[PDB]
Amino acid sequence: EEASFLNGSDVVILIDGVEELYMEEIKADFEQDEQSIKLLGCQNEISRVGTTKGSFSLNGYKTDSKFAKLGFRSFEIIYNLSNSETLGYESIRLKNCRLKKLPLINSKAGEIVKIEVEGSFRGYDLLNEL
Amino acid sequence: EEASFLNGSDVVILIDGVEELYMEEIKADFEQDEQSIKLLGCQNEISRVGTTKGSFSLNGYKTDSKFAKLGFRSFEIIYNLSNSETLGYESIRLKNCRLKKLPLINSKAGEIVKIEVEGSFRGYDLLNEL
Amino acid sequence: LDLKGSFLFDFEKGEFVKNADGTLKKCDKVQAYKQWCQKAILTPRYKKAAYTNIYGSEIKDLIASNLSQSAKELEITRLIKETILVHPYTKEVGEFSFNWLENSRLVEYEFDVLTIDDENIVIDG
Amino acid sequence: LDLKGSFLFDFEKGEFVKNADGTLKKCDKVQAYKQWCQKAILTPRYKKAAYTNIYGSEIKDLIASNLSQSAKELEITRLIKETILVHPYTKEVGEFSFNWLENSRLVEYEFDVLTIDDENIVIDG
Amino acid sequence: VIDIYLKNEKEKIDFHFPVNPQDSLSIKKEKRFETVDIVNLGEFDIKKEGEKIREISFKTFLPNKNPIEVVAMLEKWVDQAEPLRLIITGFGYNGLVTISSFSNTQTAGREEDRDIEITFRTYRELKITDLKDNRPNTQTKSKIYTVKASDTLYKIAKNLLGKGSRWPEIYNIPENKKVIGKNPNIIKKGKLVIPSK
Amino acid sequence: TKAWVAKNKELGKDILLFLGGKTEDNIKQINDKSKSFNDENIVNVGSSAYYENIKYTPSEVAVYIAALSVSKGITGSICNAKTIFEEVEPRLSQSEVKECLKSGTLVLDFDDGDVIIVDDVNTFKKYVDDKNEAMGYISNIMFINTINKDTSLKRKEFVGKIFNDATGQTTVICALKKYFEELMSQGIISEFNVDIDTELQATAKADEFYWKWDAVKVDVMKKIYGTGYL
Amino acid sequence: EIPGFYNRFKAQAEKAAATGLKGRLAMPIRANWGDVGKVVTIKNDLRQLKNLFGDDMNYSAFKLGKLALLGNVKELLLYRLVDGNQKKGTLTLKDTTENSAKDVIKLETKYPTARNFNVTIKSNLVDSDKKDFIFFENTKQLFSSSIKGTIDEIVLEINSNLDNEYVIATKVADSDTILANVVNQALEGGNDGCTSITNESYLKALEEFERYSFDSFVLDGVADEALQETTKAWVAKNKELGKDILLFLGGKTEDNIKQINDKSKSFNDENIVNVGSSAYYENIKYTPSEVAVYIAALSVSKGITGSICNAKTIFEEVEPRLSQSEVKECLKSGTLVLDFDDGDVIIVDDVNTFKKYVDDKNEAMGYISNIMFINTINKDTSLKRKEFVGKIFNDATGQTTVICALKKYFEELMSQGIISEFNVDIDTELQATAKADEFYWKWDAVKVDVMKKIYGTGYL
């Protein structure tokens, strides 16, 4: 047993090749419409693979009109997670991602102006495996 | 790394060209009905753009019969967010917005009379990009 | 079919080309067809009383019209296609392209395809 | 049906096989059929004027084509099947297999099935 | 890896579908039979010897050649009497077909694109011991021929018009009679000759 | 011209040379010339041709051969391209064809009224001592030279003009990887990898960076072998 | 080859039908041709057997190899049994210009044999400076070629062309002028070594086979009692070494049913099988020992799932033809008997020589399929053993890993439908004293048997 975890402080995100360091939350899932069909002879139900659909959520603190200006244009997100206790890093890129809705306006009271972005991506590439 | 965030205290809202400074929460999103269709040859599912639908929520503290008198008439909302630590401001206008429901009455106990407004808007213009 | 030739007319000079003998320069079937196509394109419709309603085009009348840019593109395509296709030798006209070079001054291309441009199946029993 | 035999032609040597008497080595119906099948496969279509459109194949023309690997597999199957099946003796040709051994250099197998390979029902009233 | 190629012949075009056929491809096969019911025995099935005209239908979209030109091309091909060659790689289909119905659609968004819904029909030619005439005859040549050095009019007739003895059909055309000398046997390189039909 | 092209290759300019033997040279002389210089950047035309009733010497035909090879670029190849020519001389049997192609000679062949180039080869046929086998064909050499030219073009934007830190090296590697991904989108390549040259990077400095790569080019289909089980 | 389209045609018999076969068999074959004193593997290709050992039906090699291949064996381990006195066909060819007729080239067959390989050299009619070098097997031409007159090129060409799998050239001396014209000079001095094989010679083949691994062993169509006893002892010894070899035997041609039953009862090991009926194929009679080759081939090819309880054999006729009483007597005696049923020769009941005891659950040991199943499981278990003996730490985790591997192997067996139930667990009794170099475990399984008989009762 040893400490080799990773923290979000090590996260580095390149939105269209530009460091959007102000984003403090990101999650992306690559889900599949797995068809589950039941066969006559088998007690247990058979699950068959389907096509894959990429979705991603990205929210942070506003510092400019980057996303509102961007619109629904296709772009790329390169996510890099680097291990600091030991050398090594994971590096993912979402091959072709688009927004589902522009966070045009959002604000409340004296709270910091937070921004939330949600969208979909067609595919991905795994560049580093740790 | 530097502090260049923005807070809701800097928010300035012009409802039909009139400062409704009593509103302490506003959010508007510009969402798109992205069709996602699955192709025969491609493992990953293809997402195609669609039309855009603007929605906005605006709630604050009541001070007059402005919204009840307004009714469902079309109007415009100009949202201005100004950076105070450094010069520069963002300025958005919702091109044609209408209410979805009038907050005709709302009150409870000794609490302040709060007002909540929700509606839709056809389009927008981006006037300042920071 | 038995189409026939005609005499050349240099539209650049606006005069018939004549040999040194003084006779007008005769031309082949396809050459006369091209000359006719250009002349018909240049001939406005319904206005030159020597011709029937079939002959001519209406491109000039479209300039004063209030239809939009793309509507005018479609109108140009329709007018040129209808004007050309009356000739029996014509098979198909299309592949239209447009280039609004200046703000409101246009350049357009088209392809005319002949009856001889058809492709024939090779088979016999 | 009354198909008939022919004379052997050793494609390895490109010469007719002849007995010691000097006469060409006659062969059976099925042997002549196999020789014809190989010759027809090796004969390009539409290009050797001694033959009709029925005889020959188009495998050589497919090499220069731009279709993909699997498309070329289907084209090879179609071409070989069509070329062989014109012979009356042919019943069915299929069970095609392919092996792209190198990057772009191919080996393919096929099975030809004769009319005599059919199976007959045994019954009489 | 799935692709769809439409190889037209009367118009020497080889259309490759930019986008795969959306949800699924499907093809049915139904044997030709019709019930006959005999007294005091009941229904029986009798095979019919022929084969059936089966369809392949799917729907695509043409993203931003332009989709307008592609739609015009397919609409023009719909009226074509000659058959189209449809090749589907992963599905495994390959054979002559013809388009029964074609349709395009523009949507509220994605206005540049055109959603396509096309259907095909299996094609069979009517030809109206010796080798069977099973081969389809789908090969096309230009309606005007440039005579080569080694060509003879009988050779031209056989290469470009079938039987070979069809040469007088080429000769009797007045344009061919004019470009060719009055002797049909003697012909020269370069001069254009027009096959009939 | 051979020495000049070699010198330009030393300067980083990968120029592909096409040549044709003299009109009076027989097949023996052509094969001897092809064997004498067997550089992959050199091509020998071994057959004269005719066009518009005008004879063309092998040197003249080399112009059209070079034009076709250059026009095909990366994706295409002239392995069986139907040339514009109408007649050829000499007409070679299969044995002579094999002798010429083994000798590195590029030979046009007459097939059913069509003059067709055969096998895309270059003069490099002496060694072919494994993976050097692929260097004997013009398409592979054009592919390699085009990649080298693109890599040099990307190099000259960064030599002594971007800071030689880990971030800059990663940016350069990303640019190269994305260029090879654009090549992947064309269907040219089946697999590729580009990474850091750790051996040379141990001593690199500001004015230059070192990297390594290798890729698997997709070749044009050239031959078919059929076996009819009867 | 040049780019382009190439095509060839082959008979359906020449398809690579070797895919999907099962099982391994061994044979000490008498052969007129091929390597001597060594084991060779064939992938069930009749052409491969023909090339390696000829096509002489008089010799046991081609005959019994063809019968084995007809049994659908995946791999046949053939050993060329020899008597000694081994020699290869050899010949020396000499120079013309030297009046002494100097010997310049020596030819030799690739392998020892006694076949009539011959050479014919004649003046090349096109050019006297060359000559035609045609090489024969009896009156049949076997290879032809024309070569330059220098000796080294002649030897290289004779060793170069594709069809020289039969003969190899060698230079004796150099000369300037071509060899002398000759016609059909036999490569005398060779010997196949098949003449009067000794009883002891089989032991060399057995010892060479020990290093290899195979599912079963069958004799070379010889019914000598001494050889059968020696092979019995040899198979027992190999069983002591962990190699479970299944033996097939056949009684002598003149032995009657009484002698066959006495032999079967005399040795009743489950690893031994006796063939009790001769058969005919291609109009050629086959002794019970020869038929045992095909029986072993079928048993090995069936592997685990299949069985030869009622397999329709390739044979065409049998002798003797037994009544039901004689059939019962032979099967009770452990004899394997082929029977003729409506134009088909069919093996009956899959039995082996083990029929004396059958006192329990030992009943199942009387059938060949059960013994093959047990032996295959033992072989797989030994294969998994040898990866871990003294090479994995003998802790609880390692023992659990080994148990998981064995359980997953038996689960793969379950997926084949072979077994209805199985269990594998720790042998707690032996594990109380086990150590690092070896671990002990226990198992038992319920094999699914092939349906053998049907009993019907019509209530009317």
Numbering used by the authors:
A (entry chain Z), B (entry chain d): 8 to 137
C (entry chain p), D (entry chain m): 24 to 148
E (entry chain T): 2 to 65, 78 to 141, 154 to 222
F (entry chain g): 243 to 472
G (entry chain e): 13 to 472
Paper excerpt:
Within the ring formed by the baseplate proteins lies the needle assembly; this is the other essential component presumed to be adapted for S-layer penetration. Furthermore, exhaustive bioinformatics analysis of all proteins encoded within the φCD508 structural cassette (including those not modeled but identified by MS-MS analysis of purified virions) identified no enzymatic domains or motifs with predicted peptidoglycan hydrolase activity. It is also striking that the needle spike protein lacks the β-helix observed in other CIS structures, and instead, the OB-fold is connected directly to the metal-binding apex domain. The terminus of the φCD508 needle is an apex domain as reported in other phages; it displays a conserved hexahistidine motif coordinating a putative iron ion. However, the notable feature of φCD508 is that the needle lacks the otherwise widely conserved β-helix. It is currently unknown as to whether there is an advantage or requirement for this compact needle, but homology searches for other needle spikes lacking β-helix domains find widespread examples in phages infecting distantly related S-layer–producing bacteria. It is striking that we find no obvious auxiliary domains with structural homology to peptidoglycan hydrolases in any of the φCD508 baseplate or needle proteins built to near completion within our cryoEM maps. Missing from the final structure are the tail fiber (gp67) and predicted receptor binding protein (gp68); only a short section of the tape measure protein (gp59) was modeled. Clear helical density with sidechain density is visible for the TMP lazo domain (dark blue).
Here, we reveal the extended and contracted atomic structures of an intact contractile-tailed phage (φCD508) that binds to and penetrates the protective S-layer of the Gram-positive human pathogen Clostridioides difficile. The virion can be divided into five distinct regions: the head, neck, tail, baseplate, and needle. Structures of purified φCD508 virions in both extended and contracted conformations were determined by single-particle EM of frozen-hydrated samples; the resolution ranged from 2.6 to 4.0 Å for the extended phage, and 2.9 to 4.2 Å for the contracted form.
